[PDB]
Structure formats: C-alpha cells, structure tokens
Curated annotation (Swiss-Prot), chain B:
The chain holds residues 5 to 67 of 181 of the full protein. One of the minor capsid proteins that constitute a network internal to the major capsid proteins and outside the lipid membrane. The minor capsid proteins glue and stabilize the capsomers. Interacts with the major capsid protein. It is found in: Virion. This is Minor capsid protein P4. Induction: Expressed in the late phase of the viral replicative cycle.
UniProtKB/Swiss-Prot annotation, chain F:
Belongs to the NCLDV major capsid protein family. The viral capsid possesses up to five major capsid protein variants. They behave as asymmetric capsid components. It comes from Paramecium bursaria Chlorella virus 1. It comes from the Viruses. The lineage of its organism: Viruses, Varidnaviria, Bamfordvirae, Nucleocytoviricota, Megaviricetes. Major capsid protein self-assembles to form an icosahedral capsid with a pseudo T=169 symmetry, about 190 nm in diameter, and consisting of 1680 major capsid proteins trimers. The capsid consists in 5040 copies of the major capsid protein (hexamers), 60 copies of the penton protein (pentamers) and 1800 minor capsid proteins of different types. The minor capsid proteins form a hexagonal network below the outer capsid shell, stabilizing the capsid by binding neighboring capsomers together. Induction: Expressed in the late phase of the viral replicative cycle. It is found in: Virion. The chain holds residues 50 to 98 of 437 of the full protein. Transmembrane segments: none annotated. Myristoylated at the C-terminus. This is Major capsid protein.
C-alpha cells in the first residue's frame, strides 16, 4: 500500500533511472565558503548634478571587491499619473566605465530600456518599474526617491566581482552624463515645465571585504575575468506612408565574440517609444475620447505588446554577403527569440536575435566572433505606414504588412551587440586582453 | 608624494592588434587552417598571449 | 587529446603487400628453407630439415601500460599460446604467395579480463592493436621478417620477437659494431646486447643468424627523449624496444604505426661470415 | 565599523560555514565549450494545408543537431475582441515524431494548452499567448502571424538535440494534423464564419552546426539519449446534475516509468474550457448584463482561476487494489501539487499529481513504473451540479461540494502521463529501446 | 548559413572554445536511488477552533518527512474584499519540536512577510489562491485552504528530516489558531454572528527509500544545514506631527544570520503594513463619498505605495560602530529584495541582507550575532502630517512625510533568519549549538 | 504550387549524372498583347540548389 506498493514496482526498464544509483536527493552537503562581508556606502560625485550636466564618480578603495552599484535620484514631477515613463533611467542617459585608463563599457538609457524590456522579467521587472518610476498614480508635486542599478559585468553576480584589492595602481571611475530633458519632470514633450527642480543624485557602491587568507592571494596573484561588453553606434532609417514596402541595408561595426544583437526603432522625442501611437487604449494620450491625439503618447503606458504598431516587417542578418539565416518576419525577433533564449515577454518594437543558447546567463553558450567578419549587415524590411492612427477600425482591423502613419516617426535605429572580453588583473594593473 | 607605480594608459594588458596579426601567429605555428587548430593547441595559444617586462631601478640615500 | 607534446619518432620502417588471399592451409618453402605455418597460430618453426622448437610459436607482443616493470602484466599477444590449441585470435587478412606469406591480426590480452595479478587487466579478451607478419625468403637463403604495431598515442614497451630456440644454441657469436672481432661470448649465460652488438648468430654447427635492418628512433631533430632498443637471450630469444617506464619526461607519443625489419638466415659459419661481410 | 566588524567577530559557530573552505565564488571559472552555430531554416510541407487536413514535413538535413521547431501560421480573425482563445494551438490539432518509421511521441492541441496552463508560467506564459492568441482587443479582419513552439524531448533541451549527423540511414519527420474548427477564425461556436480565410502554415526548424572534431564524434559514435514521451487515450466524464455525487474508476492503460499523471475535463464544443460557465464578469458572453448567457463563454477569458466553477470534488490513484496515497480533494490537485513541484499557478480545471520531485525538470527525480503495476486506476469524484449558473448570488456564495449546473457540459475526460524512454542511435539508425 | 559563423573563428575564441570541457548537446543525467513519495494525513491532537491550541505528532510512515501543508475549511462572513490571507491569519503560531528540543517557530505574520519578500511570481499568486478568496466570492462561500509550511526541511528534498534516523525521538508541531480572523468571524473588532468554527487537517508527503539508502540513514550519523527563525515583537515610535521620531531597537539575535527583515503593522488588521488613505485600494470605499481611512478595503490591504509606509531611514549598528551608512526606507523595500531575491516587496515590509543569495540554502554570507555584544537597529520615522482623506495630499507630497493614519501602525516585528547545525545519530537528534 | 508559395523537389536517382533541368509552367494571360514580359521567368522568383 501507498509508497511501498510504488517502491517495489521495480524493473529492467528502471536500470537507466535507478539502477547502480549515483546520487540521493534527500541529503545535500553544502560547500564552505571564504568568509566575507558586504557594505553599501556612498561615493563622492565630482561635478555639479543637474539636467544636462556631466559628472563622474571615482570609486574609493573602501574594500576588496566591487559588486553592485545603485545610483539614487530624487525628482519631483510636474505632471499627474501617466505623464512619466521610467524617468529615473531616462536621466541616466550615459554611464561609462573606466578601468586603468581604458574604457570597459558604456551604457545608454536606451540600453537600460532595452535590457529591462528584454532580459529583466516577471516580478523583478515590476519592481524595477517602481525603482525607476511613479507607479501608484502619484499626482503633480509628488516627490520620489529612485534607484537605478547599473548592469555592468560585475554588477549582477559576485562571480565577476571587480578586485580593487588587485588594482593597487589603477583607479576605477564611472562617468555620468545626465539628460537635459526628462519626460514629466522638466518637459512634457517639447514644452518646458516652469519651476521644475533639478535632480539630486547619490551613487552607492557595494563593497565585499574578504578574510585574510584569500584576500592575500587576491593582492598577489594574477587574475583573468571573462566579462561582458556592450558595443554600440546608432543609425537612421525611413519608412514611407504609402505604396512602398521599404528595405534598408544596415551596415554593422562590431568586433569580438558576440552573445547577441538586439535593436529597436525609436521616436527621439519620447524616451522608450518603440511603436506607433494610435487612438486605441493606452496607445496615445486621450485614447478613446474626443481629445485623443496620436502625436503624443500616454507616456506611462508607452510600452505595448501590439505588434501591429511596430514598424519591422522582416529582418535578416548577412555576414560577408552570406545569409546567416533565412529571412524571418519581425515577430520572430520580438517574440520567438526571447521565448527560446530568455523566457520572458519582450514588448513590441524591441527585437532580439541571439547567437547564444542562454544569453541571459554568464556561462558562455555560443558566440559569433565578429573579428573575422568584414561586413555584417542587418537587412530590414518595413511595414507600410498607411493606416490612419485615429481610426481603430483600421488600426486593429488590418493585415500584417501595414501599420499606422505615426510609425514613420520611429526613425532612430539602435543596434546593440553584447560581447565577451577578458579583463586581466596583475600587479595592481587592469586591462582588456583584446582591444577593439 | 603619490605612489602610483603604473601610469594607467591602456598599456599593460591591452592587446592592440589588427586581426591580420593572425598571419603572424600562423607563421609562428606554420599551419594556416587555424579555424580548428586553436581548439587542440590551447596551452600554446595562451602562452603566445602573455607579456615581457622592463624594470626601473633607482636607489635613494637612507638616513 | 594532446597538442605538440610528442617527440618526432620517425617510423622509418613500413610494411605493404603484393600477394593474394588464402584460407586456412599454409606451407612456405624455397631453396630447401622450410617454414611451418599452421592455422592454429601463424608461425611455428622453420629450417632445413631441422626444427628449433616443437610447441612455442614465434609471437610478438606489446605492453601498453607499465605498472612498475613487472612481467606478464598487460602483455597483448598475437597468439593465444596459453591454450596452445584454441586460436582465439581475430585475423584481419591472410595474404600469401609461394615464398611470401603475410598476415594482419588483432592481438589478445594474455590474461583476459581476469585479475591473474594484482588488478584486472582489461574488460575483454581481444584488444585494440593490429600486428603484421611479413615474411619473404630470398634465393640466397636469407629471409626477411617484418613486424608492425599500432599504439594509440601512448608510450609502451614493445617486444618485436618472442622466439624459443632448441637447446642446441649453446655457442653464440656476435660482431661488435666497432669491427673489433666476431666475439664468441657466452660466459654470462644472461646475454643482453646493446647497440654495440651488431649481429648475432647461434652456431653449434649450423647457424641461426639475426641481423637487424631498421628500427624507429627519434633522429630527425635528435630529441632528448627515450628511445632504446636491445637484444635479450636468456635461454629464450627476445627483441624489444622501450619507450617509457611508466612515464618519461611527461611527453606522449604521436600514435602512428611503428614497425621493425629483422633479417634472419641460416647455414654454416662460413656462409654467415660471407653474408655479414658488408658492415 | 562596517563589514569588518562582523568578519573579526569570528568564532566556533562559524566553522561549519567558513572553516577550511572549499570554494570562493567571487572568482567564477566558466567551462570552455564546443564551437557551434544556430540557424533557422524553412521546411517544405508535404500535402495540401487546410482545415481538417493532415500534412507531413520531413526535416531537411542541413545541419548536425536539431533543437527547437516552431510551426508558423498566418491567421485572419473572423470575430472581434474576446472571440478567440489560443487559436494557433487549437489549429495545431496534433503532431507526432517518427524516426525511421517508429513513432516516438504524439501531442494533441489540448495537451499544448494543458502544458502551457500547467508547466509554463509568469511572463513566458503570457508571451506564449502573444505568439498563439490575439491579446490587445484586435478587431475582425485583423491578420496576425502566429508561432507555436513544439515541446518534444529535444525541442526545449539543447542537451537532447536530435543527432541527425548520426541518423545517416533514417528519415526524421513530423506529421501535422490541423483542426477542422477553430473558435473565432473558422467557426463561432458551432456556426460557420462565412468568408473565413484558410490559414497558411510554414514549419521552421532550428539547426545546430558543429565544428570539426565534435561533428566527427557525433557522426561516428553511438548515442544513448534519455527522452520524454506523452501517453494519451481519451475517455468520457460522468458529471451529475442534482443530488448525486458521481464517482468514476478509470483504469489507466499507461506503460513505462513516468513523471506524473495529469488530467482535465473538457467541453468538446468550446476548446480550452476546463470549468463551468457562470454569469460572472469575464466568465461568459455578456456576463453581468441582461444579455448574459451561460451557454456561451467569453472566449478570450475561457480560462479562469475560480475553482468554484470546477467539476472535480475529490480524487485518488489506486495501484493493484491498494491506495497510492490518501484521498484528496479536487482543489489539492489544482493548487497544491503544482506548488510543491512546478512552482507556478495552475488554472481551474487542470489537475496534477506528480510522482517526481521536479516533474518540470529535465533531470529525472522520481517516477512511476506503470509496466510493473497490475491495475492503476484513477478515481474521480464529482461535485453536485446544483448551482444556477445565472445567479451570481448562488455562484459566488455556495458550499465546496457543489458546482454549476453548466458543469455537465464537460463531457470529455483527458488523462495524460509523461514518460521516460531511451533513444538509441547506432550505425546511423535510430529507435527506442523499450516497447509498450 | 550557420557555417559562416563557424568559419568566423578567431583568436578571441581561445578562451571560449579552446580544449573544450563541455558541450551543450550531450547531457548526462545522474542516476538516483529508487524512492516513492506518498501523501498521508496526520492526526490533530486537540480541539480545533478559534483561539484554541492543538498539536500533532508525526507518524513514522516512512524513511524521511518532507512537505507539510495545513488545510483549513472556512466559511467567509463577508462579501468579496472583506478578507485578506485568512488561512495563514488563522495559522498564528507553528512550533517545531524534534526530540524534546525546540527547533523552530513560525508566525502568521512571518508567513505574510515571507510571502511579501521571498515567494514570488506566479508562485506568489498561487499562494494567495491557497490562502484567500480571490475571485470576489460573496458571503457564505465555503473554501478549502492550504497553508504550506516553510521550515528548513519543507522546501528542498536535500534537507528532508530522516525519521528512520530518529526512531527514539518525537517530532511534533504545535498550532495556535487565532481567536480573531478578519472576514471569517470578525469584521475589524466586531464579531460576525453565526460564524462557523474551522475544520483543520494536516497533510504531509513522505519519502520511502529502497533498502540500501534507508539503511545508511538509519545507521550513519548525519548533519543537516538547518535554518532557524528568531523573533520577539516590540512597539513602534510612530510620531504624529512636526517631528520625525527616532528609535533604537536593542536586538536579541544570535547565530550566523543570513538576513534581517521587519515590518510596521496595525495589530488589529492582519497584513496592514501601511497607513490607510483615500486613494484606490488604500482604504474602504476609497474614491467615493463613503470612503473611510479607519478601515482598509481588506482584500487590497497589501500595496506598493511606499508613501503610506512609515520608515524614513534605517541603520544597523554593531558594538557601537555602524554596519553601513544610513539609507532611506525605500532602499530596504526596493533595492535589497531586488539585489537578493529578484522579486517585489509590498510597502511597509523591509529587508536588509548579510547574504548574497538568501533565497538559496547554500551559505552566501552571514553576520554571526553570537559573537556580537550589541546589535541595534536605528529607525527614523516619517512625519505623519498628511491628511489621509485628501488624495491630492496623499499623492502629492515629499518623501519624509506620510498619512496621519500611520499612527495606527503600533507594532514592530523584526525577524532574523539564520544557520545552525542539526545533528542526528543512533536514532536521536538535536542541535550542535543553541543560543 | 502557386503564387507566392515556396515548393521544392528532390531529384530522384534514376540515372548516373544530372545535366539540364527544364522547369515547365502553365500560365493563362489575363491581359492584351504586350502586357507581359517574360512572365514564366518573373514567376521563377528564385531557385536554391
């Protein structure tokens, strides 16, 4: 009876499951670890903090390893609920990481938006939104303290923690160029908000303090860290309103083993707008009422899942004139690739093509080494932008090859390459093994 | 007054090479179809990527 | 799974065939020199109205792994001579023509899977190395015998010949490679002939001569590796070459096919000295 | 001050954690992998594609290993908002994999829906629907390109990729049967939609290309793959009306070691309906208004979480005349078993009992060897269907042992079990090791 | 095609593909000992009802005991929205005893804090389905609830308790069942006439092993990396107006601690960690003329509006010296669960960790409070000056102020979660160290 | 076979070697004289071997 009637139901077809057993699930031995402690402390920001200002932070040697870094902002908005859309990271428009005089990485607000729109998923992203936005319908004059975590190679897992202990003679710095405009705080579209306050910023860095035995090895021995980089340059594209299905060959300039290529089509006047706006719920300001205006988003709901508002009909990657894969339609890169490679939902207008089985992880799982490729091209085919955005009958009642006239504003093309490099540490000096 | 033995000018570990350097490695390794050779020659390929050093001696007077 | 950590050990000798296929009945003779070649095991005996053993076959063998220099451990033999009746050896091909037999055969582990010593040798009786037996008798009474092994990129201890001579092999004469003299030396009764031993013959009255022709060595770049070959005769005839005693310089072997060429001949001492006159 | 204040506060109680440590995880060493590339290649479908038609697709041997396979459909919606419910996988009526003439697995459209409802969770599940349904209130005439990823033993686990380079002698192919009726596309309920378009299908396969030494090894060496199979035979329910508590004793015809036993109850007319229909907002067409009916669901919300509308009262599995575990109530199989084993949320009407610790995992973790059991029976006790489905007062406020009168429509009994088997690849020929 | 990517192979690959160690297309599964899992009901010793204390003794049906779910059958006394986690609210105190020695003890508020911090995604929704009425069920609805227990041995088979190895020791759970459960037998402080008493049962799954492993468990000594919960409650120092109160809590924790979590609550309303306010979902009737900020709209008690929370800042000090520099309250609600868990945390619940992966079981950093003389948690409160009834003021102010209704959050609950070592040998068990 | 469709064929090994390949198409002209310009070639949008 019960478990034993099951347990004895043993045969030859069990020889490859329970025969000559190797493991038992019901006694785990846990590994003992080098003793350590974590601290979160402030760094000094060098320069005036405000809209459009450039400041830098030099990370003081308060400890042995550096792991996460969280940048604090305090903003007060001049708009009611729905007028903001990740304003904390829109401000953080460009963060550059320097180690030993060498640039290791550079992230853009648009990248933080693409990463959040692509690899951060589930409850973790809802939290991120409350870390970077006004979520619970706050009104004009509401103040919020924001947290924008950085996602450099040493920020998410201790496995690549940055050893200052082993960088005795090289300083580590972060450069912070801040945006001149943040939607809902000092501008509403192009219209300035009178009396808007300047942001206040503080940069917090997480230190690890190691026990004496291992930290000595850190200071004395060489290290090789297998780390991630972001490579980027922006471009410009165009899609006609009628009679023509446009194509455009986008010329890529990337190097080193690549985990993936991700991209979007942005309206430069409204941060994170990757799809057409329309007089359907959440797709423009005032949608569903007589005041609906398809030239301005209902900002807090800028991200959508409606692929018919996206501009990409199809895309192909060619390497040295060779088709890397057969042409796929745009929904493949918006929905099937993140399904296969990540396991979450990518909002419309954000596209991914991976070279890796698990690009969300750090264990290398397949790369494209652009160091041997002379000319990589991303071939884009665009949707006809002939639907009048103000008429739901056509916006939600049409064919896959056509989108709304407001899609012609998604003129900024932003292609990101996620790569590998190796950060070597020796005798207090740091640097990347391959420089490109 | 400030002890900073290294300059910090991307010198020390940064390999600034044009990928044509691959021909330099092929000449040293003799065989050109190195699409696959580096997979069976890991130990030698790593040695070819490590450094050499020069030292800056000075002596001061003790008190 | 190695990169460049192998010596240049030049397999100078090689064997090929130009004969036809035959089944399970063999007999080779030319100009009175007979070879006894049963199907129970390739090589039994030979001579001119004489025999040199009644039971033992002229097997070759190889020791793939040396444990500590022990004997009869991990010895892969050409012939299942332990049974001496059940020829439990897989043969790849049996080529021959009159005067010139050949064979390719797969070896067996003398102990099988059974731990006759301290540990188990293998999991099966039949191992993974192919050996070669090429015999060519020449009209002048000289017969060339070639042996080959195939080692899977490992160092080993190979035995080119295991031969048992009749007790009428008391008188041995050899030439020193320095042309000192043809020395009649037997007083040790434990005979090991290093490089300096040029040619050996055993001659109570009619000689059995052995003259080495070729043996692989690292001499392309003359590496400091271990490549030593010696003769042994201690009431039993053995020709072997050693690569490494369990480990040597921690360097591996390319894994190609290595073979040896040994010249065998017979007759009175007069014919011996005339044949080995060329030095 | 700081972390140093706890590192020095070291004693005996720390030894079990940090004394004589084995690892430091701040120096993660990643394992070097085998060079490979991923490519998407289009397959050619044999046979006319259509409603109610069967076609086959043989996988073109362009690469070495096969991982995912995605079926692409182009659908035109014949209804308006909320008239469809995962129509892409309803259309994909069933698929089976045949290796050299031997079938390995057989999936049915309601399995795909069960799997999605039972094992796929969070953003992933939402994205799955995005690929298989219309989710932004699209209107009649809208065209959308749909993707249905297949879930055979090799599709979502790279480690079990089908080794075509090692099947030199066998054909590998999938058979596809497409449904005759798809709600909101070809039929609305049981009424044909005049002018409905015939969806177009394309089958895509993602290939893995190997480098020099590994391709040789895969081609020349035999392989032993541990694979998954789906076992299914359909039956009929015994759902009562008033005063009777029904009980069925369904002898199972399963074989081999399995991970779990899962089932649901279906309305054959309304695909995906696993619960009763009641005049509850979001549960029926017109629900909450005078036009509400409980004979027609609000199809876009066919699935629910309100177990009150469930038909199953209690259940147990019995093996050889003796109980496998003690009787549990229906709510136990809908919520607790998946909590204890999958880690997601299972909607009402889908029930699971596991034999494994990690049934969602690829690593074997417990089983049930049906081939060694004389009589495995699933006992299902039903709720009395006495609630008037049209009265929210009775639907939202009654006892645990009763359900809606409309539950009697769940006439199909779908019991599934997921297997273990072994796929042998030897001298270019494939077949499974164990029969039954 | 893809060949083109294999062709584009370079020097940078020496670190990625050189002398391969693994491949991703040839997985080898480890073989495991034959076992079976069975669901068995335990008998409750005592009278089940509101305010009663009962216990259960574990029947040694098998070789190890792993996952315990306590089932309740409740009748709600109100309409949808009047309840909020009633199953775990009733499950007030769960005490774990192994061999006469107290090993652990969990509280209903810890179950809500754990659900607020560590259980996430669809699993947290499903948890709510097991503990509440989530489909707007009306008065009279009857439902079977499941409250899984979260002791050290409950979530991972690797810490399953080997009863076969404990044949001489009693394993028991004591259950305190709350006298007042919101929407079931009380609405606020007002009794609901005719409310039914609860029915309870305890189900646990057993592990049955084959001959060789059960023998090893029965005869060999074992150590388990047992985790424990430590808790004592204290009062808050919530100010009314014009001042931000300071408070220093003297902590009574010991053992190698993974993290410290705490909340500010209204002891009258289970799960209320925030002030009530006349904004959507923040109080009964919110947004209408009937709105009141003295009673929550219970089913939506949990919110993410941190402006209704009372922590302006927190700092932990060890032996007179600060452990980290003072952070604002939103740091502990939004950043620490982000860094450590990767989930969400509702307003009013706060987490600070010493561990990098506290959601995991393998050690990832501890603070050992067994070696610390003075552990103090310093709090700064927000000034409770906003008129809770005016959404223009509730949704339109600065970070250092909150609702005047926050003064109801009179109870402070600080939890600590730590490591210990559970020893089992010759049929008996106990802890290696207890402080 | 049809407008906008992708089809393929596997060459049956009836013989030893392959030389010429001729694709037959049957089309109906919908317009007047001069309204077409190599329509069988336009239809043969592409071929991969």
């Amino acid at each position: 009876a019960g478990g034993l009637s099951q347990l004895v139901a043993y045969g030859a077809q069990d020889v490859y499951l329970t025969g000559n057993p190797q493991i038992t699930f019901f006694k785990t031995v846990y590994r003992r670890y080098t003793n350590f402690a974590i601290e979160s402390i402030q760094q000094t920001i060098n320069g005036s903090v405000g809209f459009g200002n450039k400041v830098s932070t030099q990370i003081s040697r308060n400890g042995d390893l550096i792991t996460d870094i969280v940048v604090e902002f305090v903003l007060t908005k001049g708009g009611n609920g729905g007028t903001t859309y990740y304003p904390a990271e829109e401000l953080l428009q460009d963060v550059e990481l320097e180690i030993g005089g060498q640039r290791i990485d550079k992230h853009y607000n648009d990248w933080f938006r693409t990463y959040d729109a692509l690899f951060r998923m589930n409850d973790d992203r809802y939290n991120y939104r409350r870390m970077t936005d006004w979520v619970n319908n706050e009104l004009v004059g509401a103040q919020k303290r924001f947290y924008v975590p950085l996602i450099f190679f040493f920020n998410q897992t201790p496995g690549l923690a940055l050893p200052l202990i082993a960088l005795q003679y090289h300083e580590v710095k972060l450069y912070f160029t801040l945006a001149s405009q943040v939607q809902g705080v000092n501008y509403n579209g192009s219209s300035a908000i009178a009396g808007a306050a300047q942001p206040t910023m503080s940069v917090w860095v997480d230190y690890i303090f190691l026990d004496t035995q291992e930290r000595t090895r850190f200071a004395q021995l060489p290290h090789e860290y297998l780390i991630e980089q972001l490579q980027f340059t922006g471009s410009e594209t165009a899609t006609p309103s009628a009679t023509t299905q446009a194509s455009q060959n986008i010329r890529l300039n990337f190097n080193h083993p690549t985990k993936y290529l991700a991209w979007n089509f942005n309206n430069p006047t409204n941060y994170g707008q990757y799809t057409a706006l329309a007089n359907i719920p959440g797709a423009c300001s005032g949608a569903g009422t007589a005041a609906a205006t398809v030239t301005t988003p209902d900002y807090g709901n800028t991200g959508t899942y409606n692929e018919q508002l996206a501009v990409l009909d199809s895309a192909k990657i060619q390497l040295n004139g060779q088709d890397r894969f057969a042409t796929r339609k745009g929904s493949y890169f918006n929905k099937v690739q993140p399904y296969q490679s990540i396991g979450g939902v990518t909002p419309a207008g954000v596209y991914l093509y991976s070279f890796a089985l698990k690009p969300a992880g750090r264990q290398p799982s397949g790369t494209c080494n652009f160091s041997r490729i002379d000319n990589a091209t991303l071939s884009l085919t665009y949707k006809t932008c002939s639907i009048d955005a103000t008429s739901p009958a056509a916006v939600l009642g049409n064919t896959e090859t056509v989108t709304a006239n407001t899609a012609t504003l998604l003129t900024a093309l932003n292609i990101y390459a996620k790569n590998y490099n190796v950060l070597r540490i020796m005798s207090g000096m740091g640097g990347l093994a391959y420089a490109n | 007054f400030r002890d900073t033995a290294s300059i910090g000018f991307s010198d020390t570990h940064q390999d600034e090479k044009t990928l044509r350097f691959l021909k330099k490695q092929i000449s040293q390794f003799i065989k050109h179809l190195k699409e696959y050779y580096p997979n069976n020659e890991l130990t030698k390929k790593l040695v070819m990527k490590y450094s050499d050093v020069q030292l800056l001696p000075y002596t001061k007077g003790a008190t | 799974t190695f990169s460049l950590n192998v010596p240049v050990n030049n397999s100078i000798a090689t064997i090929d065939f130009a004969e036809h296929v035959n089944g399970a009945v063999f007999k080779i003779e030319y100009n009175r020199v007979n070879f006894i070649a049963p199907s129970l095991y390739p090589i039994s005996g030979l001579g001119t109205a004489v025999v040199f053993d009644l039971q033992k076959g002229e097997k070759a063998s190889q020791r793939k792994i040396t444990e500590f220099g022990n004997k009869d451990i991990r010895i892969a033999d050409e012939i299942s001579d332990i049974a001496a009746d059940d020829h439990s050896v897989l043969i790849t091909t049996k080529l021959m023509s009159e005067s010139t037999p050949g064979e390719l055969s797969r070896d067996v582990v003398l102990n099988g899977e059974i731990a006759t010593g301290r540990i188990n040798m293998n999991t099966g009786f039949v191992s993974d190395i192919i050996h070669t037996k090429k015999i060519s008798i020449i009209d002048d009474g000289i017969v060339d015998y070639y042996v080959k092994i195939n080692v899977p990129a490992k160092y080993s201890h190979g035995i080119v010949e295991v031969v048992s001579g009749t007790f009428l092999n008391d008188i041995m004469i050899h030439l020193v490679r320095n042309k000192n003299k043809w020395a009649l030396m037997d007083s040790k009764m434990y005979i090991v002939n290093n490089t300096n031993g040029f040619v050996i013959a055993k001659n109570p009255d009619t000689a059995m001569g052995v003259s080495l022709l070729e043996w692989p060595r690292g001499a392309v770049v003359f590496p400091p590796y271990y490549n030593f070959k010696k003769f042994k005769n201690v009431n039993k005839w053995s020709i072997s070459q050693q690569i490494a005693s369990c480990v040597n310089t921690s360097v591996k072997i390319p894994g190609g096919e290595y073979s040896w060429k040994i010249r065998l001949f017979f007759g009175p001492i007069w014919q011996v000295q005339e044949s080995i006159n060329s030095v």
